[PDB]
Amino acid sequence: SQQVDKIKASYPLFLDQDYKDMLAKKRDGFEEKYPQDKIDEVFQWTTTKEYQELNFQREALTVNPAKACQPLGAVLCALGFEKTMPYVHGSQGCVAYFRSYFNRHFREPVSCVSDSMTEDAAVFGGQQNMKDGLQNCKATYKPDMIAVSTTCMAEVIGDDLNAFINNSKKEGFIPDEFPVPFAHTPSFVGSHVTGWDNMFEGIARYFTLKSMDDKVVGSNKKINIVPGFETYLGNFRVIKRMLSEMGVGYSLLSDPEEVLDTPADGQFRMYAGGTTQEEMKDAPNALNTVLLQPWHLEKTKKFVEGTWKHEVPKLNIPMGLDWTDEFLMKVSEISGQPIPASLTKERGRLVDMMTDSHTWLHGKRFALWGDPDFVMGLVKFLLELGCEPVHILCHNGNKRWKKAVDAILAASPYGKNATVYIGKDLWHLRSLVFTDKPDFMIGNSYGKFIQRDTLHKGKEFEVPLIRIGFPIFDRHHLHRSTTLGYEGAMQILTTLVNSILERLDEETRGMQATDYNHDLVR
Amino acid sequence: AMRQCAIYGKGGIGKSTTTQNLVAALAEMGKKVMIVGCDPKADSTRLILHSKAQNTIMEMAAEAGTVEDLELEDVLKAGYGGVKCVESGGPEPGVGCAGRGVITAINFLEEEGAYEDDLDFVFYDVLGDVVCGGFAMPIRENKAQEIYIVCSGEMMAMYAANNISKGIVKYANSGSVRLGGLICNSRNTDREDELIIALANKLGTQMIHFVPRDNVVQRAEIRRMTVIEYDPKAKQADEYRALARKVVDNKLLVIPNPITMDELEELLMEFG
Amino acid sequence: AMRQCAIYGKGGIGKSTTTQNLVAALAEMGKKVMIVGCDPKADSTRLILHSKAQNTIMEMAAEAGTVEDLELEDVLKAGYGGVKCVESGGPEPGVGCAGRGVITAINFLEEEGAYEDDLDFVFYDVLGDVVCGGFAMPIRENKAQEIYIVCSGEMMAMYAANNISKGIVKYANSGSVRLGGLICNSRNTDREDELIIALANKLGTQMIHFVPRDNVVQRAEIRRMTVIEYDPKAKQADEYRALARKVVDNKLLVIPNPITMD
Amino acid sequence: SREEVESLIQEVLEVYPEKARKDRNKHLAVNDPAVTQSKKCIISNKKSQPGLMTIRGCAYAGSKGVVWGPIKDMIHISHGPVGCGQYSRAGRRNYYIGTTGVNAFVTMNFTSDFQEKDIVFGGDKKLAKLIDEVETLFPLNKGISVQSECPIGLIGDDIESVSKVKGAELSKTIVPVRCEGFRGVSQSLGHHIANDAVRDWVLGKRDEDTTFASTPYDVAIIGDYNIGGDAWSSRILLEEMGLRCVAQWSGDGSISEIELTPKVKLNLVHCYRSMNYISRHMEEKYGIPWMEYNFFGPTKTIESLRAIAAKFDESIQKKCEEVIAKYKPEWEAVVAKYRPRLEGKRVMLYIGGLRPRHVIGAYEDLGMEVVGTGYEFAHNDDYDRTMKEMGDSTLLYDDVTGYEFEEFVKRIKPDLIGSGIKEKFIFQKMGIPFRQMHSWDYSGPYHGFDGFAIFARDMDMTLNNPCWKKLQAPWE
Ligand SMILES: Nc1ncnc2c1ncn2[C@@H]1O[C@H](COP(=O)(O)OP(=O)(O)CP(=O)(O)O)[C@@H](O)[C@H]1O
Ligand SMILES: Nc1ncnc2c1ncn2[C@@H]1O[C@H](COP(=O)(O)OP(=O)(O)CP(=O)(O)O)[C@@H](O)[C@H]1O
Ligand code: ICS
Ligand code: CLF
Ligand code: SF4
Ligand SMILES: [Fe+2]
Ligand SMILES: [Mg+2]
Ligand SMILES: [Mg+2]
């Protein structure tokens, strides 16, 4: 039933007595469902130390992973260049998924094509699909550039991207000077951050490999910035703002900030802004190249050190105070510009915030996950705050990264109770937050399922989710946030101390029971 | 019951030739037979049909759009002795995935009821090197139950006979597939027959038959037909009849015991 | 400075034998050579290394967890004459995907800089039936630039040389990869050398050398050696030196013209 | 107009290379409600032209995302690399009642997460080991499906074998599904491979069993995936009408409901496209009749209730007329409130395989007109059903391209578009009101009388929102 003045959607509609009664009959009659008694006992068992031991013996099964595959990163990379169409050579199912995935995170259109390789293209190869596809795409959507990556099936069968594209050009499907950079992006290797590294390297090699002869390092007086797989619009914007503020000439290579934030003004723009082809061609002339997220830009770094001959600085991701400081001094060192009074003041305003909030953050325990550089940046900042990371999970992490993060942890009194996990998923993490309960989780939307689980055990075991990372599908416009630099650090500090205060108020909102500590002033 | 056999062996050892000749003799005995080529080139049925095998399943499917659009009638042809012929097809060398071509093709035959005849025998002629799961599709459950490995007195063939057996063991265990025997296609190596009999023993099988090297085979091949048809009176035509009845009457089905590269060498040394 | 060559030919023709005997002579001439085996049975370096070279690339990756964890030191070994050997590896017959194993191994060698010591030659030994893109990995751009196709006088071997040449064309047109010649590994057929010269002409290439059938080759093979190492004075041993000298001096690199069977 | 629309078709098609032009021309038509053979006017279910930004998915999405995934007390393994399973995790809102991770698993992502060694050496050993770990960590699971992603089908892994062997060792139904993404041309073949697997591995488990107590009023709901609770909102009407719903395929579905479906008297098929396969099979094997119904809006629902009740005795017909009389004042008030706000409005639709024709009824009940519609992957029998439901000189498109759809809308200028998440943000930026017609924009249900109320409210809130008058800056 519906009262026309107050229509109910699925919640709370299905709580009406007639639906509830109907669902009771469904279950009893046809579901052959395990008794509630058993379900509760099984549930309780999965929260124990013994279930954790079994759970951590897994060797073949993955449950709720915290990563996606390579071409997702390639697509994001390709999106960052002017009038560029991401083009994924292989099965079209993948593209439908990549677009949907980014649509939901960005609440924006996401442009990308497939060349629709079917069963006969599986056994004969995708040479024809690549010919017809490059021609059709150029004609219909008119990009300046098409950036080609691969699905897993094109990789199993070894479709030679370089040859397929050269024959397309040789046979007149697209003009020879029409730029078609490529990168093999196999999904069964690494993860989506690895796909970003691979795609960027293809494009950079495409524009600079032939013509190294006339390049002189330092001759355009600018600093190359490579951001890596990045999904906070504010992150592109803050790097650009701090460099402009210092007077540093800079060149952001892969810049999707504009095209992922177009205005609603009556027209759809498939393309907007981004790194130009001329900027890439000119990149080897820069003073140096800074990699924002080095732990997934290793292939890019070898090409840039080897072919461009830049002394790429050893910098951590510029998150939190020390590493933002370190980033700014090194940009200062490369370019000759001193650090302006305006950035120095901003630094002291983040310090002021740390001093103001330290009593509430101190000793607070967090479980967290995400991509390698993000996680280590977030871990470093939690330590600078007097917080205790407890469970650090990075599913797409490696042994060397794990070694670096264990060193940061051990350098501080606040890391004594923390352990780093690589190769482990969100079902592992779920066990950890039941057996060794932290105060909060910091991760993406997928963590809401953990929070629901911890709550089902009991309100005193509930571990709230703090949404920082990618993808965030169940809040709106968090993709406009910042995590880098001083600006990112202020936002994170504010998100953290206020999650802490929001939770405390909930635990103290009980009339004449807990509200003696329901303070007006915190 | 219908009997399914898969023919394996070193590249160039004479599988297709032996298979088609074995099958012609079977048809000549009054058996109802189907041949399934699992090789990207389309030569497995060419001596039964009297011309190249132009319409492979993959080619017809690509032309029709998808295999789902394809008719069984468009790919199944009958030749000498009423023998049914079909080819998987696949790419030319160096692109695509010939393994998937076989997987696709076998699945097509199953879906279109290619086995739902009164067939007495189905023979799968398979590629030399079994490089992937697709080329072992012929020996999964409900496919071949008998395997014959065509070899010779030469080093390369016996190493290959042994290596293929390693691959067989995995399928024999989870299925009913068994090694039936070795067919020795002579290269005129000295004491050739003794050597293959010996190799057969260490594995646990027999040497089913010795097929001599006879230039009549190549004359018939140039005429695009089997020896059984090219020269029914020939001595070689009798060699294939012999092989046929032995496979027909064969009951020895084993899971092979692969030997070590050392044993294989000491064996060559013991006979040569 | 560096020359990369890929050896193709019909299954069972003598590629791995011919390749290894050539390299032996090449090393004996004072060349720095690497052999890259691109066959799941991993036999391509078995005669340069006596008895064993236990460690294929895929094997070590499977054991080590991932290819990225694997160091160059683990899979590349030296045998007779300082010849460097590495094997792709792959699955046993009938399971997995040997093609992808080749892609991964060749990609590993590139990423780890295996090509930049001070090498004169790189040889890729490929298996007979080239069933997928993986097995053309050695003839992509920046890989092999010279291809030699092993054949003989019998109908089937030549037919294969021609089909491999068609597979080459798409890699040859769009790249720098070129056919170097046909190497005739004799089967003692009538007027065989003339016959292979004729085929070479129709393709647009030459026959670089006629290699006689000589059972010392198999006798040395049983000893896990090249003829060069097993018996340096034999007639066959001088044959591989002649083949070796010619490959050093070859300048003929063509795009082949495949013929219609008539 | 008929000629004007034909002209619009020829102009749009002018941008394409000739091969793509000759083909895209076959998939765009000007409707005739008189035509009953759609082959004559349009063709569908063909492969997409490369590089044209189709909105179509793959076979795996069709099988795992759509048919199998909703079945709540099985564990569905995304077999292969980690991507597929991760982009589809909780993306489709197939609602279910259960204790997730214990006895229910719908929102979870299970995968074998292929690395390079698993590709090269194959993954049957890992799959076997994977099933052991599952049975350890989720002992209340009542069965397991193995959903192959692209590379499982290339390399030729033997998942049927692993399913027979492991299933025997554990006395567990394990369903191997070859829903390789390169198979077919879209989601559609995945439905089919999903239905054949249900048939081959589950539907027959109780062929010999006669313990279940059956009545002449037993029915199954086939082809409702309970988006936002659509099926729960349908089910209530059928039962108030005195029918008993033994099964729901596959929204809120259990493996036991599926096994008990052969005991019903009639199959109620909502989504024809995705489950007409198993419905024909159940008629052929068990003698069960099946019929298509539409519970979108009051007119279609009222007509469907009467048609279904007519398959039984007069008691059920009496109860039919009761249910109708009960919800009559509720759907009439919805009409009185929302139709005056929607009357005369024009909508263009583009969805998968059922809704582009099915929901036309609900729009008309609010006085709206469907001026254009099309499918991602219908077959010609869907377009046979479609053309009488559309008005004359309306536009029909199949596997429409991003470009085509963009340009059609520019000319036709509808007030509302109802399509998917990939379409959404393009058209909002154009100032055109947009409703998601797969996910219902996280709202719904829209099925039945209770859904229609949410349906009316959603179409009005969006179309008449104050944000749509704000797109131009006052100063330009
Ligand atoms: N017993 C015999 N006597 C003489 N010639 C024979 C023979 N058996 C086979 N041949 C010839 O040797 C050549 C190779 O035959 P076939 O094509 O059957 O080998 P095969 O199938 O192992 C090669 P592939 O690996 O390419 O499939 C053919 O010309 C055939 O006529
Ligand atoms: N010139 C020659 N004279 C005599 N025998 C020879 C020979 N060349 C090669 N052989 C023998 O023929 C067999 C095949 O040699 P090899 O293994 O190198 O062939 P191949 O590599 O083409 C087979 P595949 O395609 O499966 O890799 C070996 O036993 C070898 O000793
Ligand atoms: S199953 Fe089909 S695309 Fe019939 S694959 Fe798709 S939940 Fe659509 S038009 Mo998404 S044939 Fe259902 C459908 Fe319709 S996922 Fe849903 S909305 S009624
Ligand atoms: S049609 Fe999968 S998303 Fe792809 S690159 Fe492979 S991991 Fe990543 Fe369908 S089954 Fe899946 S989604 Fe595609 S791969 Fe195929
Ligand atoms: S090895 Fe087999 S599966 Fe792997 S690509 Fe080549 S043919 Fe296809
Ligand atoms: Fe937006
Ligand atoms: Mg053959
Ligand atoms: Mg070899």
Report the C-alpha gap between A365 and A391 in whole angstroms: 9
Four-point Cα dihedral D454, D457, D462, D466, nearest 10: -150
Count of domains forming chain B: 1
| Best residue among B88, B100, B102 to mutate for probing ligand 5, ranked by most atoms within 8 Å of CB | B100
Q: Cα distance from D373 to chain B (closest Cα, Å)?
A: 26
Sort out which chain D residues have CB atoms less than 8 A from C66's CB and list them. 115-117
Residues of D labelled catalytic: 58, 61, 92, 191
Using CB atoms, which residue from C61, C95, C98 is nearest to D117?
A: C61
Chain B: residue whose CA lies nearest to D125: B170
Angle, alpha carbons C229-C231-C234 (nearest 5°) = 130
Identify whether the C-beta of residue A504 lies closer than 8 Å to the C-beta of residue A439: no
Helices B235-248 and B15-28: crossing angle in degrees, nearest 10, is 80
Q: What is the per-residue DSSP string for C91-124?
A: PPTTSSBHHHHHHHHHHHHHHTTTT-SS-SEEEE
CA-to-CA separations, D347 to D228, D344, D352, D373, D390, in angstroms, rounded: 22, 10, 17, 9, 12
| Best residue among C217, C219, C227, C239 to mutate for probing ligand 2, ranked by most atoms within 8 Å of CB | C217
Backbone angles phi, psi at A394, to 5 degrees: -145, 100
Identify whether the C-beta of residue A165 lies closer than 8 Å to the C-beta of residue A138: no
Tokens matching residue B126: 């398979």
Report the C-alpha gap between D12 and D5 in whole angstroms: 11
Q: Classify strands B77-78 and B84-87 as parallel, antiparallel or unpaired.
A: antiparallel
Nominal resolution (angstroms): 2.3
Backbone angles phi, psi at C96, to 5 degrees: 70, -150
Pocket flag, ligand 4, residue A152 (CB < 6 Å): yes
Four-point Cα dihedral B213, B214, B219, B221, nearest 10: -40
From ligand 2's centre to the CA of C172, what distance in Å?
27
- Domain D202-316 carries which CATH code? 3.40.50.1980
Report the C-alpha gap between D330 and C242 in whole angstroms: 97
Question: Which of A123, A156, A180, A193 does the annotation list as catalytic?
Answer: A156
Report the C-alpha gap between A225 and A237 in whole angstroms: 12
Identify whether the C-beta of residue C121 lies closer than 8 Å to the C-beta of residue C5: yes
Report the C-alpha gap between A280 and A292 in whole angstroms: 17
* Residue ranges of B 80-109 with Cβ closer than 8 A to chain C: 90-99
Report the C-alpha gap between C114 and D139 in whole angstroms: 50
Q: Does A101 touch chain D (CB under 8 A)?
A: yes
Report the largest interatomic distance among the alpha carbons of chain A, rounded to a whole angstrom.
Answer: 82
Of D56, D88, D62, D60, the closest CA to residue D377 belongs to D56
Report the C-alpha gap between C140 and C120 in whole angstroms: 19
How many Cβ atoms sit within 10 Å of the Cβ of residue C223?
Answer: 16
Q: Which fold has domain D59-201?
A: Rossmann fold (3.40.50)
Report the C-alpha gap between A330 and D471 in whole angstroms: 44
Q: Classify strands C84-87 and C77-78 as parallel, antiparallel or unpaired.
A: antiparallel
Tokens matching residue C202: 């129709």
Q: Cα distance from B29 to chain C (closest Cα, Å)?
A: 30
Question: Which segments within A316-411 are labelled E, that is strand?
Answer: 365-369, 388-394
Half-sphere exposure of D322 (CA within 13 A, CB side): 13
Q: Cα distance from D179 to chain B (closest Cα, Å)?
A: 13
Of D274, D378, D354, D270, the closest CA to residue D61 belongs to D274
Report the C-alpha gap between A348 and B181 in whole angstroms: 84
- The boundaries of every CATH 3.40.50.1980 domain in chain D are 1-58+341-475, 59-201, 202-316
Report the C-alpha gap between D391 and D377 in whole angstroms: 21
Identify whether the C-beta of residue A482 lies closer than 8 Å to the C-beta of residue A491: yes
* CB contact (8 A) between residue C100 and residue D119: yes
Distance, CA of A273 to chain centre: 21
- Specify the residue with its C-alpha closest to ligand 1, atom 15: B14
Q: What is the per-residue DSSP string for D219-246?
A: EEEEEE--BTTHHHHHHHHHHHTT-EEE
Q: At residue B242, what is the residue type?
A: A
* CB contact (8 A) between residue A133 and residue D50: yes
- Residues 6+ positions from B78 with CB-CB distance below 8 Å: B84, B85
Q: Is the peptide bond before C91 cis (omega within 30 degrees of 0)?
A: no
CATH number at residue C92: 3.40.50.300
> Hey, what domains does chain A have and what are their CATH numbers?
69-214 (3.40.50.1980), 215-319 (3.40.50.1980), 320-363+484-522 (1.20.89.10), 364-469 (3.40.50.1980)
Report the C-alpha gap between D456 and D448 in whole angstroms: 12
Residues of the domain holding B158: 1-272
Chains that touch D (3 or more CB pairs under 8 A): A, B, C
CATH of region D1-58+341-475, choose from 3.40.50.150, 3.40.50.1980, 3.40.367.20, 1.10.10.10: 3.40.50.1980
From ligand 5's centre to the CA of A156, what distance in Å?
7
Q: Sheet holding A145-150: strands in order across?
A: A113-114, A84-89, A145-150
Secondary structure (3-state) at D389: coil
